[PDB]
Ligand binder design. Structure first.
Ligand SMILES: O=C(Cc1cncnc1)Nc1cc(F)cc(O[C@H]2CC(=O)N2)c1
Ligand SMILES: O=C(Cc1cncnc1)Nc1cc(F)cc(O[C@H]2CC(=O)N2)c1
Lengths: 304, 304
C-alpha cells in the first residue's frame, strides 16, 4: 500500500550524461552509441540568444570547438550536425554504458521521469507529466539544459524529452530527441506564453482509482453520470473532455475496483462542484493529474 | 525555478540489488563488498511470522538454503549471521559495482530516497521522510521487503533504511543497515501501532523559504512572533516545537531570502490558524513537511 509520485530508476540514463562546452557555455549532453545529443543553444552567447541565426552561428564552429566530457574523460569530436533544435556531435568512441533505447515523442497527458543534471552530472530524479499546453512543471536551474525525460520498458529506455528553456511563468519547455519542440516554443530569448493549461481528466480518474485501491473511499457516492453530462462539468472546471478511449483505458482499474468508470466520474463531478471540505485523498488536498492509468496499474502491481 | 519532491539518482544503489530466497520466501537483498544484507524474516513461513523465534528458525538454515541471485548470476553463500533484524550472507564474490558507502542511522525529520524493488529488480525511486513517529509514508507492496533508503554525498551512498513491514495503517516500518528498527516495531505478524505523528516544523519553514525563492509570496505578512508564542501554536496543531537549533539551520535560507526566521514563523502561524483559503503554495493545497533545509538549499542551488 501507499501511493507516491514515483520515478523510474535512473541508472541507465546516468551512464549517458556528459558535459558539452562550446565557447563559454556549458550544458548537458546525452551520449548514446557514438553520438552526443544536446540543445543547439550551446553555440550561442547571451547576445546571440536575443535573435539567433543558428545556421550562421554553427558555421563558425568546428569539431574542435565542442568540448565533450564524460566524467573525467575527454571525448574526441569527429562530426557535428544540427537536427531541428539539437546538435548531434559524433564522437570516436561508442558509449560502453549505452542501454537499449528508443527516441519517442510522447503525447500530452503522458508521464515521464526527469534526470536533472548540471555539468554532465546528475543531481536528482523526479516524475513529470507533459501538460496539455506542452510545458512541464519541473525543477530546473541555469545549467540544467540538456537534461532528459524518459520511460523504461523492462530493459529499454524511451527518451522523450530534452530540457531547453524556462518560461518567465516558471514552467519548462523542451524538445523530443529529434530536436522538435513540444508546443509552439522556439529557442530564442523572447517572451513566450504557454497557452491555457487543462487538467488531464483521465489521469485524475486513474488517481481516484489508486485512492480506492489504497483505502481512501470517502469521496465515493451513490450517484452516476453520462459522458455528455460529466463533460459539461469538465469544460466548466478546465478539465479535458472525457472520451470513450479514456473510458476504455480506465477498464483495468474499473475491473480491479469493481466501480464503473461513469460512477467514478460522478464522484469527480461532486469533488469538482463541492471541493474537498478540508479532506485529503492519497495525502493530497487537491485533485492529482500527473499519474496515468498505466502508472496506477504499475505502482499498484509492482512492475520492475 | 520549480520545486519537486526529488530523489537522488539511484544508479549506485541499483547496482547493489539482489534477490534472496529462503525456502518459499523471496525478498530483496543489498549486496555490498562480499556481504548481502536482507530482512531476517526471509527465513520465516506465514505460520512462523505469528510469533517467530528467529534464533531457532535460523538454526535450521545452512549456507546452501539461502539462494542469492544478482540479475541472472547465482552467488555462492559461504557464511550466514543474524545482526538484530537483518541477515548478513557472506558470498564468495565482492560486488564489482559496490559504490563508496556508509551505514547511517538517520534522525526523525530527515529525508532519504527509496529504491522500491521486487525480486531483486528496481521498479521506482521516490523521496521520503523518516516521520517523528519513526514510520515512513512509502509505496511498497508484498515482495518489496529489503528495499533500501539512502542519501548520496557526491560519490558516497549513505544507506539509512531497509524496508521490513507495513502496518495496517498503510504506513511503513523498517530498520537501519545494522538491523535496528526505527521505532518500537518488531518483525512479528502482530498488531502494532505507530504512535501519534507530528508535523516537522523546521521542514515546513524550509519549504516556505523554497516557496518565496520560487515567487510564491502571497502568504508573507506584516507580522512577527517569538519562539515561545509560535510554539504555543505549534503544540495546538500537532507541530514539532521549534528550537534555536532549528532557527540556526534555517540561517542560510533566511540570509538568501532576507526574511528573518521569526517572520517566516508568523506567516506559518497565520497559515495554521486560517488555512489556505483555496490557495496553493508550490502547487500544494497543504503545508509540506518532507523537505529539510538541506534539501531546499541543494534543489535551489543545483548540487550534483
Ligand atoms: O531558460 C533557459 C535556461 C534555464 C534556466 N532555468 C531553467 N531552465 C532553463 N534558457 C533559454 C534557452 C533558450 F533557447 C531560450 C530561452 O528563452 C526564454 C525566453 C522564454 O520564455 N524562455 C531561454
Ligand atoms: O508487511 C509485510 C510485507 C509488506 C507488504 N506490503 C508492504 N510492505 C511490506 N511483512 C511483515 C513482516 C514482518 F516481519 C512483520 C509484519 O507484521 C505486520 C503486522 C504489522 O503491523 N505489520 C509484516
Amino acid at each position: 500500500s501507499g501511493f507516491r509520485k514515483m520515478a523510474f530508476p535512473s541508472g541507465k540514463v546516468e551512464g549517458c550524461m556528459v558535459q558539452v562546452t562550446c565557447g563559454t557555455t556549458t550544458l548537458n549532453g546525452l551520449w548514446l552509441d557514438d553520438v552526443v545529443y544536446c540543445p543547439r543553444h550551446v553555440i550561442c552567447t547571451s547576445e546571440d540568444m536575443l535573435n539567433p541565426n543558428y545556421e550562421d552561428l554553427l558555421i563558425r564552429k568546428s569539431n574542435h570547438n565542442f568540448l565533450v566530457q564524460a566524467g573525467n574523460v575527454q571525448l574526441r569530436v569527429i562530426g557535428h550536425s544540427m537536427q531541428n533544435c539539437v546538435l548531434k556531435l559524433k564522437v570516436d568512441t561508442a558509449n560502453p554504458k549505452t542501454p537499449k533505447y528508443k527516441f519517442v515523442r510522447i503525447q500530452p497527458g503522458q508521464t515521464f521521469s526527469v534526470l536533472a543534471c548540471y555539468n554532465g552530472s546528475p543531481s536528482g530524479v523526479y516524475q513529470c507529466a507533459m501538460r496539455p499546453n506542452f510545458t512541464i512543471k519541473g525543477s530546473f536551474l541555469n545549467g540544467s539544459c540538456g537534461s532528459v525525460g524518459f520511460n523504461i520498458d523492462y530493459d529499454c529506455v524511451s527518451f522523450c524529452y530534452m530540457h531547453h528553456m524556462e518560461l518567465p511563468t516558471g514552467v519548462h519547455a523542451g524538445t523530443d530527441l529529434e530536436g522538435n519542440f513540444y508546443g509552439p516554443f522556439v529557442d530564442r530569448q523572447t517572451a513566450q506564453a504557454a497557452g491555457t493549461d487543462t487538467t488531464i481528466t483521465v489521469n485524475v480518474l486513474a488517481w481516484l482509482y489508486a485512492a480506492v485501491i489504497n483505502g481512501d473511499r470517502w469521496f465515493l457516492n451513490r450517484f452516476t453520470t453520462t459522458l455528455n453530462d460529466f463533460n459539461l462539468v469538465a469544460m466548466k472546471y478546465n478539465y479535458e473532455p472525457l472520451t470513450q478511449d479514456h473510458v476504455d483505458i480506465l477498464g483495468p482499474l474499473s475491473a480491479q475496483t469493481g466501480i464503473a468508470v461513469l460512477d467514478m466520474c460522478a464522484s469527480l463531478k461532486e469533488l469538482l462542484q463541492n471541493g474537498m471540505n478540508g479532506r485529503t485523498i492519497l495525502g493530497s488536498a487537491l485533485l492529482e493529474d500527473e499519474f496515468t492509468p498505466f502508472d496506477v496499474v504499475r505502482q499498484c502491481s509492482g512492475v520492475t
